[PDB]
Design a protein around this nucleic acid. Structure first.
Length: 76
DNA sequence: CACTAGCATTGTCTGGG
DNA sequence: GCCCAGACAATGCTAG
C-alpha cells in the first residue's frame, strides 16, 4: 500500500465538501483564495455547527491509532 | 509525454532550546 | 513540560 498520511483535523474534514462547494460556485477562484474563504467561514461557524466535524476528526484520530499503531509523525 | 513545487487555510504534532 | 519554528494533513490549478 501507499505511505501513511496524517489524520484530518476538524477543519480539514469540513473543508473537503466546503471547498468543493465554493469551487463549483466560483469556478474562477484558485485554491489559495478558496482557502482564505474557507478559513473565514470555519471561524464563523458556531460551536454546534463545528461539533460534528470536531467529533469526526477525533474518531479519525482514534481510528488512526488502531489501523496504524506504530505510526509516528516525522516532519522534515 | 512525465514529473514537481507552490499556493493558502486550521489544528496537531515534532525536535531541540 | 512550555517555547519556537515549522511540517503536513485535502484540494487542484499553475507553471517550470
Amino acid at each position: 500500500g501507499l505511505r501513511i498520511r496524517r489524520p484530518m483535523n476538524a477543519f480539514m474534514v469540513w473543508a473537503k465538501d466546503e471547498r468543493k462547494r465554493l469551487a463549483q460556485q466560483n469556478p474562477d477562484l484558485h485554491n489559495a483564495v478558496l482557502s482564505k474563504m474557507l478559513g473565514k467561514a470555519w471561524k464563523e461557524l458556531n460551536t454546534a455547527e463545528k461539533r460534528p466535524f470536531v467529533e469526526e476528526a477525533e474518531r479519525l484520530r482514534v481510528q488512526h491509532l488502531r489501523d496504524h499503531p506504530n505510526y509516528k509523525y516525522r516532519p522534515r
